Structure formats: structure tokens, C-alpha cells
Amino acid sequence: ATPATMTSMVSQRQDLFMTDPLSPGSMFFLPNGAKIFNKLIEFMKLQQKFKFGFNEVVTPLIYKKTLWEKSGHWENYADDMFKVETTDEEKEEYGLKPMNCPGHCLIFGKKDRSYNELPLRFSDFSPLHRNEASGALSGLTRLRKFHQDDGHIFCTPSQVKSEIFNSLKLIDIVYNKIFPFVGAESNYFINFSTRPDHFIGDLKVWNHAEQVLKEILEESGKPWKLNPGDGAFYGPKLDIMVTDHLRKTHQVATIQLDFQLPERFDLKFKDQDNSYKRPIMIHRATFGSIERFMALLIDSNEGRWPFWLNPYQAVIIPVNTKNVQQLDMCTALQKKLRNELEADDMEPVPLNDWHFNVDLDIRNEPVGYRIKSAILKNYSYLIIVGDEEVQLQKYNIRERDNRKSFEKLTMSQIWEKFIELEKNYK
């Protein structure tokens, strides 16, 4: 079985995604797929805004050909770029953005910048488009449209290493802490991607940029490999490489050292001596393609999501669907955990309340088969209620991946237990 196949099998079983040839290379996120998608974005936004000092911006999707010419993307990134011309009488040429670099340069240039605000970090969770061949499309790994935690840092020379080390820290949080993956201790190795045949700028600067990067690479102690000619046209980069269960490698994140784009946009800040100076840019993405990241999570978990990510967090199963006592206790729990409001009052859903994806299977089917269905769907928890549970007023709850043991918990305890799980990414 291939990863694309595993992704597809899980998607069909959990109703995650769908595709349509009227929009080739672009995913549809069904409700369950969107829940996972949004969960990942929410998590990443938090780390970037409240831990790594990033400020999110929201940018246009299409830009006139001119901007791409000014950045150097139009030529030096021509084949990957999704180019269009409008079909109105005055056919203007456009590029759907394949990345946010130029737009973020416009933003940097919009206000007078001072050394006071460096490093200046912008994050952007926008749809990117890249027009690659039909025969190159594969599941969620290769798409024409995908989302990315695009990000750009504007800093001074003495800030470069610190900024890249903090970049690596976030990368490690994602790939070596929060998520489980199945050679070395780390779930990735670094590709040292060097000057491409077609590069913009001066060779001695390029040499300098590659020297700085390699020094950081060495100081990090992280395993790395030389990756000749795969740098961006504007600078060399550290590409984070994750390995398939079929031992195929994928770039999932990147850190790019860019001394060139600032030149092309005439970027400048007022230094600690009132002189003007070019900021250095660090391009960065931790998820890279969020779609690709999800595909790789699935390659490892085979649909067995962590509780906090799971669109199927818990199912509640009454032994006898005709029993009012069992039903009441089940319904009571579902309402508590879902924490929803009625559409009949003017009372709004408050910010930062907890809401859990828990379902209630009262289908007229044998209890054993309702349980088997829940198992196939990879519910993180199975919550069963029989006469004894009603009597004790405690729920029988067991975790999907624990085979024999189980807990008997009150409604309040389950509530707090789930809060604990999700709050801290279990």
C-alpha cells in the first residue's frame, strides 16, 4: 500500500476529503477533514503568535505580472508559477501567488522601519497556487493548490543565527514532540540546498549566505546532507526532510536565507546610527504544505488520530437503544461534551469554551455491531452505557489504543479529562 492509497482509504473511511476534475489538483475538505485542517492551523497560529513572536497578516491572492517581475519570480520561478490572463477586453496578466515573499516586502515597505522592531516577523496562512503537471499530482503531497504557514522574518546580521535557531525550535516542536511519526532519533534530516544554476544577485554574497547557513548547521548538531543546486533563486535554504514508511523522502518545512529580495524592493531600515541598511530576510514554513503534512500524519497513524485532532473524539453507545434510563444518561453526556447552544435564544457562543466531537449511536443495530463500527472509524474513546452504568451513574469509557483496561467516570470527570487531553495536544 502506498501513502496516497493509505490517505485515500482513511479519507473514505472518515469522510475527510474529496476531489473533482473541475478543479484538478485542489482538495475539498469535507466537514471531518476541515476539522483536522482547522485544528492544525489553530495550533500553529498559537505557537507563532504567542511563543515565537510572529504577527499574522492577510494578503491578496492575485498580483499583477509586474510584482512577479520585480521579485524575480516571473522568470526564475516561471514553470511552477500559476500564470493567467483575464478574459475581459483588456487582458491583464496575473500570477496566483505561489508564495508570500513579495507581498510581505510590500508590507515591510509600507511603513518606515527601525532597528527597534527587528526581527520583524510576519506569518501568513493563505492558499498558495502552483501549476504543475497532471501526471505529477498525488494525493495530498502534490497539489496545484495548498495551504502553508508562510512566514518571513526581517532581521539584522547578528540576529540571523538566533532567528534560525528559533525556527528550528518550532520545527522540532512539530516533528519531534507534538506528533508521532514512523531512522535517526529525529523524524527528519536537513537538506543543505545550495545555489541553483539560475540565481539572482552577487556570487560573493551567495558564498557568504551559504557560509552562515553551514555554520548554523554545524552548531545545531543536527544531521544534514548536501543538496546541490536546490536552493531558491534568491538564496540557499535548510529543507526539512521527512521519510515515508516506504522510505521515500519529502520536504515538509524550510528555512531560507535571503540577501537578494530586499535589494530588488529597495528595502531599508534605520539602524542604531541613523544610517539606512538592507534587512536580511528569512523565509520560513513549518508545515510547508498543510495538506502534505496531513498525508504524512496519515502515513504514520493510518487514521488513528490523537484525541485533540480526531474528528471522531468519542462515541456514546447505549446497550439497549430502547432503554430510557440508558438513553438519558447517554444524551446527558453528549450535550455536556458537545457544549452547544440552542438557536432559539439570543445567547451567543462565548470565546474559548470547550467543544468535543462526540457522537451518539442509537441506531437500531446490535450493540456489538455499533461498537465494531466505532472501532473502524477510529474513535479515540468508546463510551458504553448499560444497566450497571445507569445504576452507578458512571460511564464505562476506554481509549481506542488500550486493549483491556477502562475507566468508570462521572460526567464531570470525562469533561475535565477531555479538556486535559486536548488542552495539551494528546
Residues belonging to the active site: 101, 130, 148, 150, 152, 237, 283
- CA gap 404, 426 in Å, rounded: 20
Q: Is 67 a residue that touches a copy of itself (CB under 8 A)? A: yes
Cell (9 digits) for 332: 446527558
Binding to a copy of itself (CB under 8 A) within 171-190 occurs at 172-173, 177-178
| CB nearer K ion, residue 119 or residue 311 | 119
The full DSSP string for 348-362 is PPPTT-----EEE--
Q: Is 53 a residue that touches a copy of itself (CB under 8 A)? A: yes
Q: Is 52 a residue that touches a copy of itself (CB under 8 A)? A: yes
At residue 176, the 3 state secondary structure works out as: helix
Q: Helix H segments across 15-50?
A: 31-50
Nearest distance from residue 206's CB to Zn ion, in Å? 17
Identify what 225 binds: a copy of itself, Zn ion, K ion, none; CB under 5 to 8 Å per kind: none
The CB-side HSE value for 52 (13 A sphere, CA atoms) comes to 28
Stretch that binds Zn ion, among 1-9, 74-82, 91-99, 181-189 (CB under 5 A): 91-99
Identify what 63 binds: K ion, a copy of itself, Zn ion, none; CB under 5 to 8 Å per kind: a copy of itself
Stretch that binds a copy of itself, among 12-20, 248-256, 321-329, 391-399 (CB under 8 A): 12-20
Nearest distance from residue 96's CB to a copy of itself, in Å? 8
Stretch that binds K ion, among 97-105, 134-142, 175-183, 240-248 (CB under 5 A): 97-105
Nearest distance from residue 39's CB to K ion, in Å? 23
How remote is the C-alpha of 206 from its chain's centroid?
30
Q: Is 376 a residue that touches a copy of itself (CB under 8 A)? A: no
82 with 130: CB under 8 angstroms?
yes
- The single-letter code of the amino acid at 211 is Q
The contact mask relative to K ion for 139-158 (x = CB under 5 A, - = no) is -----------------x-x
- CA gap 106, 152 in Å, rounded: 12
At residue 258, the 3 state secondary structure works out as: strand
| CB nearer a copy of itself, residue 173 or residue 282 | 173
How remote is the C-alpha of 369 from its chain's centroid?
35
The full DSSP string for 177-245 is IIS-----SSSEEEEEE---SS--S-HHHHHHHHHHHHHHHHHHT--EEEETT-SBTTB-EEEEEEE-T
Nearest distance from residue 287's CB to Zn ion, in Å? 14
At residue 269, the 3 state secondary structure works out as: strand
The contact mask relative to a copy of itself for 347-366 (x = CB under 8 A, - = no) is -xxxxxxxx-----------
331 with 405: CB under 8 angstroms?
no
Q: Which of 40, 96, 101, 374 binds Zn ion (CB under 5 A)?
A: 101
Binding to K ion (CB under 5 A) within 396-425 occurs at 408
Nearest distance from residue 235's CB to Zn ion, in Å? 9
Closest CA to 426 of 337, 313, 338: 313
Distances (CA, A) of 18 to 3, 21, 31, 79, 390: 16, 11, 11, 27, 41
Identify what 277 binds: a copy of itself, K ion, Zn ion, none; CB under 5 to 8 Å per kind: none
Q: Is 131 a residue that touches a copy of itself (CB under 8 A)? A: yes
43 with 174: CB under 8 angstroms?
no
Q: Is 283 a residue that touches Zn ion (CB under 5 A)? A: yes
Q: Which of 169, 372, 408, 426 binds a copy of itself (CB under 8 A)?
A: 169
Identify what 182 binds: a copy of itself, Zn ion, K ion, none; CB under 5 to 8 Å per kind: none
Binding site for Zn ion (CB under 5 A): 99, 101, 283
Binding site for K ion (CB under 5 A): 99, 156, 158, 283, 366, 408
